[PDB]
From a paper:
Oxy: Fdred-CAR provided the same observations as those of Oxy: FdCAR (2’), which were a clear density for a flat aromatic compound in the active site and the CAR-binding-dependent movement of amino acid residues Leu202–Thr214 and Asp229–Val238 toward the entrance of the substrate-binding pocket in chains B and C (data not shown). The electron density maps of CAR were only found in chains B and C, because the symmetry-related structure partially filled the entrance of the substrate-binding pocket in chain A. The active site of Oxy: Fdred-CAR showed a six-coordinate, distorted octahedral geometry with two water ligands, while that of Oxy: FdCAR (2’) could be described as a distorted tetragonal geometry with one water ligand. Notably, the nonheme iron and its ligand residue, Asp333, moved away from CAR by approximately 0.5 and 0.4 Å, respectively, in Oxy: Fdred-CAR. In chains B and C of Oxy: Fdred-CAR, the average bond lengths between mononuclear iron–Asp333OD1 and mononuclear iron–Asp333OD2 changed from 2.0 Å to 1.9 Å and from 2.6 Å to 2.2 Å, respectively, which made the coordination of the carboxylate residue to nonheme iron clearly bidentate. The slight movement of Phe67 in Oxy: Fdred-CAR was common in Oxy: Fdred, in which the single-crystal microspectrophotometer clearly confirmed the reduced status of the Rieske cluster. This suggests that this slight movement of Phe67 may be specific for reduction of the Rieske cluster. In the case of CARDO-O, reduction upon substrate binding triggered displacement of the nonheme iron and residues including Asp333 away from the substrate, which increased the accessible surface at the mononuclear iron, opened room for dioxygen binding, and allowed binding of an exogenous sixth water ligand. In other words, movement of the nonheme iron away from the substrate when the Rieske cluster is reduced might act as a physical mechanism of gating oxygen reactivity.
Carbazole 1,9a-dioxygenase (CARDO), a RO member consists of catalytic terminal oxygenase (CARDO-O), ferredoxin (CARDO-F), and ferredoxin reductase. The mononuclear iron site activates dioxygen for reaction with the substrate, and the Rieske cluster transfers electrons to the mononuclear iron site during the catalytic cycle. In the present study, we determined the crystal structures of the reduced CAR-bound Oxy:Fd complex (Oxy: Fdred-CAR), oxygen-bound Oxy:Fd complex (Oxy: FdO2), and both CAR- and oxygen-bound Oxy:Fd complex (Oxy: FdCAR-O2) at 1.95, 1.85, and 2.0 Å resolution, respectively. All Oxy:Fd structures solved consist of one molecule of Oxy (comprising three subunits: chains A, B, and C) and three molecules of Fd (chains D, E, and F), and the asymmetric unit of the crystal contains one Oxy:Fd structure.
Numbering used by the authors:
A (entry chain E): 3 to 109
B (entry chain C), C (entry chain B), D (entry chain A): 1 to 389
E (entry chain F), F (entry chain D): 4 to 107
């Protein structure tokens, strides 16, 4: 629906990524930068790689296939060969629980 | 951006960008063929600034797509498959793109693929003017074509006719072969000289005022940037060639006065006025194909007020101007350009060349080109721009 | 082992060894010719993994010596001098080597040399199986041949027939051209489709469960290492190709069901089952010759219980299978491989390629190959290992 | 200097300069053609030590200019223009040079240029001797030609006749093949051996100590630098080649004894005496053209006291010696040199070669060449020496 | 004979001044610190003006191809320059810079 | 059985001393610190004399192609060498070094 329950905020350490699978839709990736949470599509826009299997360097996620990268906050490409922006999904913490939007931001 | 050894670029402080631009200047319009050479639904391949491109005509309008599938990087042109009027399908795995915007609109081997509609093949603006096909090899909204054309080429009544071919030399050697007042020594025996009764010296040497002979133009309203070598009004025509004070060769004392002024303009087009006849003009481009080759795009312009004057000029072009001038005169320029390849091939020629006074205009051009070009094409532009966060 | 720019290898974290293996994998068996191509006492030359080799048949058994004299590095094959049944003498200074162990046993130009009996020319294990000549391009006693062969290739009843040729592309481009379920789009007009009444979709797209369609094999008792792409049992056959929702092309709706499953095995051999007919199988190797070329070793297997069948199979092969399938079907794979060369020639294609769903199996192969290969061949292996330990 | 990987040079401590001298040794005289090949007023082109040169004969005397215009670096020879007996004018912008000293004496396209008399085209000394054209590819005042020629080549009564051609191998491979004591094995089936009844062993079993294998000459009356092959002084000639103790080949038991005296001299010329007949000698040069090619300048000398003897010798040369010896014997040396190209092409053979006893002769030459050459030619000499403060 | 060029203070340290001479080739006067030197202005390798180049210590670098000369000896300091520059003795008296009329 | 090479004191640590034998191949005696070792003098990769090479610790580098051997085991230490060197027994007695006539 609108807000998808992911996990407890405390279940994620800073600098970690969590994949959120969805029935009938493409998977999402939730990142924890410090004590803040962000989310984007899980599939790298350059191909078929799963960004949740990549490496998070601050607020920049690096794809494990070709080394492309994106800023997890804005979803904008940070490293070649990536050129297509990721869709970003709002994340909110309700009573210590992590929720991710079911629809991406329009812009 | 690092096309040439940094040690060499550091040595040519006056025009490093120019020396680095072995692949040409990005973000400029370039003529690549004549309109009559590309027909409805007949895709044509070509390489420009090192990039393989495909041009097609749909409902009369021209479209340009990079000739390289996004998938495994093969040239779509190996086996052209235009399944529908508005698209082209890669012969390999069937990824399909729209000519109009390069968007991957379908994949015959996987209609459910998540890549559909989320990838786009590079496209370049194409414009037809004066029967010539210009491709804006650049990014973003293109500037007016006029910015990259020499004065008068786009005049309402200017009738343009020409010829194009691939020459085996870097484009800059071609530019400096054309915008060189002393090189005409090589044309002293051209059939055009006698057959068209031309007045042509062995060379045009610097007059008493350099600042008057060379005119740098960077204040043109249409934004064109170029350099004039006023050889006719400020230069000195050398008619008697001497060795040890003795006359060994003389120029041509014909009646027709031509080549009053020459001018070279970014991205690399020369205008000879008037030529090859007092009532005509020659506009020629040296278009970068790759680091070793260029299109020698020659055009001759002559004002024509109606269709009768145009068909008359066309007939004169085919029977006289093309064979006598474009070929009879400029053919020697071809092997001359090829002859400079070795000296500049290792990029060392840009350091070891020994210039003389007449080269002052070329130097002005190198400076202007380095300062006003709109971008240096790099190998990374050809393979795929790279950047690490 | 450092065959590719480090900056590129650092980017392909999922399969760097594979990208680095431009010269192939050392310490694996590779087919290079058919037994009938090498006769008793007639040495034949060939290049494998960049190394020039010599093969000779003595008393029916095959022996392999590196085709490079230890002395001044000339190829012995420039002028073959086998002066005794068991040896070969270099034509230059007559250093003589034994085919069986490569030992320098004599030197005609100096029978007292201290080098005699103290030097050894490289030898490689050679084994014949199913009428095919396999060479172990590696060091140390070889593993069983079956480890580097697809399942069933070595079955007692399996009759093997085929052809071999040199193709101009890196071996990996060939592997990925073969182990690609969506590439068959290029075979949609092959004469085998209609003439053999085959059921062949435009492409096989990923089915419901991805984990079920791809099966990585690293538990084979024989030691085999490979990947299955169960397109027939878990994939989706796309028979109607659409653009904008309109059908523009359809697959082959024949009766013979083929290509139920495909598998790729180290060091680089594909198994298509069943193919080209429901009662046959195709096994093809993409053997590295050098970084730009590979042997396209094709073989077709069909169970045969007696000579009458074998002879019948051999007759069908020559009249139908070879011309209609191996050539009629796979010929298009040749130029397809050649078309991918440019994109990967600078190694940049391994970074810029844009893959889609059906490429999941290929990715699995790249990881398997990276993790289970028995060695990365390097140019140093070719010239002579270098080290300061 | 610095023509080879520094890591390789560091390894070959016995003769690093030699390994680095891929382009040959600068500051030495080299024969490049025969006198009869260049006539009065007919400029001839050639490449020596990587440099393009022009040779002309004016009033009977030879002159050599670098075939590269100072202006834009084109070869003047593309279109030769000798407008006065003492000069040559570039076909491009008419810069004119004197053959005598290379000075830029005039510029037809700009008679008052400040460059006139201020620039100089590189010139090299040229001398004719024994009907051969020698060029001193070096700087400053040349030493006597005698320094760079084998003993007796310049003898008053020595009649010299020969042949010259371009061979596809680096010059060093040619030098070593010529001076190689054991390479004689490749000549075992030469027509000269049987037709001129020569005694020719298959090789030699060395005798005595290492120092006795050669005789190094560090200085002659004229400063010659060379090495004599003395393997036959204490060594045992091998006439029966055996493998496993079984005779498989025999040398030639002719009555004529030749080549009792063999020496190699800087910059790279071999002297075989007597050869191919007891009453004559052979002097041959392996002249560096570029890194992959050399001139194989062959000459045969026979003392002649009068014009009758010289005429007779000339007749024997054309009808017998040239076809039977220069070609019939040495043609095998040609493909032998070509066979060593690959092993040394990557400079790795200079590290991996496995030498044996008779190679003491080659090692002595490598050391002598390394210690006494007059300079290492570099690509920088070819393009233009470089130095930055 | 000598040519009065300018006041010493008219030139800031490390700068170059072109001195034209009607009917003769121009000269280049260099101020290295508080010392003055002079040579022909035209690079010996082409048509470039050394007065438009870069001075590094007592070495002038041509703006065209990076060639260089030592302004004190006139000898080449960097390739592609091979022909020595003409040197003109300079004399400073009472705050006025004078350059020899003839190359010595 | 043993040949007198020299006085142990005649060799500075890290030096090589060639030992020529009548009617036989030469040997190489190395002094690594306070211990002595010996191997055949001829490099197994060609015809070079190792005694003319450079000793680094217990490793001798051949002067011809840069190959190397551990002088204690005779095993190849650097390419292009691959053939083990023959090692000879060495013993010091009364300050004098002796080498065995035959390899161990
Ligand atoms: C001077 C005079 C005429 C010409 C020139 C320079 N460059 C040219 C290029 C093409 C056609 C004519 C000319
Ligand atoms: C899918 C379906 C058939 C084939 C394939 C992939 N790859 C192949 C290679 C050779 C022969 C047949 C095939
Ligand atoms: S799939 Fe992510 S960089 Fe290519
Ligand atoms: S290479 Fe074009 S669709 Fe695969
Ligand atoms: S190169 Fe083979 S024996 Fe010398
Ligand atoms: S290149 Fe020779 S005069 Fe210009
Ligand atoms: S014009 Fe001064 S370095 Fe070339
Ligand atoms: S001869 Fe010792 S390394 Fe070659
Ligand atoms: Fe021209
Ligand atoms: Fe295929
Ligand atoms: Fe020979």
């Amino acid at each position: 629906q609108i807000w998808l329950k992911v996990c407890a905020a405390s279940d994620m350490q800073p600098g970690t990524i969590r994949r959120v699978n969805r029935v009938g839709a493409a998977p999402l990736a939730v990142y924890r930068v410090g004590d803040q949470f962000y989310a984007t599509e899980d599939t790298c826009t350059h191909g078929i790689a799963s960004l949740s299997e990549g490496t998070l360097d601050g607020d920049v996620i690096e794809c494990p296939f070709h080394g492309g990268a994106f800023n997890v906050c804005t979803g904008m490409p940070a490293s070649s060969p990536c050129t297509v922006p990721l869709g970003v999904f709002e994340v909110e913490v309700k009573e210590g629980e992590v929720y991710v939007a079911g629809e991406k931001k329009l812009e | 951006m690092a096309n040439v050894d940094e040690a060499i670029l550091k040595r040519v402080k006056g025009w490093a960008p120019y020396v680095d631009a072995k692949l040409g200047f990005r973000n400029h319009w370039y003529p690549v063929m004549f309109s009559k050479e590309i027909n409805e639904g007949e895709p044509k391949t070509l390489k420009l600034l090192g990039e393989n491109l495909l041009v097609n005509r749909i409902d009369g309008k021209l479209y340009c797509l990079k000739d390289r599938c996004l998938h495994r990087g093969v040239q779509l042109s190996v086996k052209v498959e235009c399944k529908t009027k508005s698209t082209i399908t890669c012969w390999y795995h069937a990824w399909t793109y729209r000519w109009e915007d390069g968007v991957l609109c379908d994949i015959l081997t996987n209609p459910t693929s998540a890549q559909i509609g989320r990838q786009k093949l590079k496209t370049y603006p194409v414009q037809e003017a004066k029967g010539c096909v210009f491709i804006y090899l650049g990014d973003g909204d293109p500037p007016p074509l006029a910015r990259d054309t020499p004065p008068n080429f786009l005049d309402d009544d200017m009738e343009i006719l020409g010829k194009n071919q691939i020459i085996k030399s870097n484009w800059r050697l071609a530019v400096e072969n054309g915008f060189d007042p002393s090189h005409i020594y090589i044309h002293k025996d051209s059939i055009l000289v006698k057959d068209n009764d031309l007045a042509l010296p062995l060379g045009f040497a610097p007059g008493g005022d350099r600042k008057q002979q060379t005119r740098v133009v960077d204040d043109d309203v249409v934004g064109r940037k170029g350099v004039y070598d006023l050889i006719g009004e400020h230069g000195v025509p050398v008619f008697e060639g001497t060795i040890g004070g003795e006359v060994v060769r003389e120029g041509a004392y014909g009646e027709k006065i031509v080549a009053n002024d020459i001018s070279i303009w970014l991205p690399g087009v020369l205008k000879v006025n008037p030529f090859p006849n007092p009532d005509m003009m020659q506009f020629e481009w040296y278009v970068p194909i790759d680091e070793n080759t260029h299109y020698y795009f020659q055009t001759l312009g002559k004002p024509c007020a109606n269709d009768e004057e145009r068909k008359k000029y066309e007939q004169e072009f085919e029977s006289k101007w093309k064979p006598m001038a474009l070929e009879g005169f400029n053919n020697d320029d071809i092997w001359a350009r090829e002859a400079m390849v070795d000296f500049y091939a290792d990029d060392k020629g840009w350091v070891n060349e020994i210039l003389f006074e007449s080269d002052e205009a070329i130097v002005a051009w190198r400076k202007l080109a380095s300062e006003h070009n709109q971008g240096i094409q790099t190998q990374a532009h050809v393979s795929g721009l790279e950047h690490h966060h």
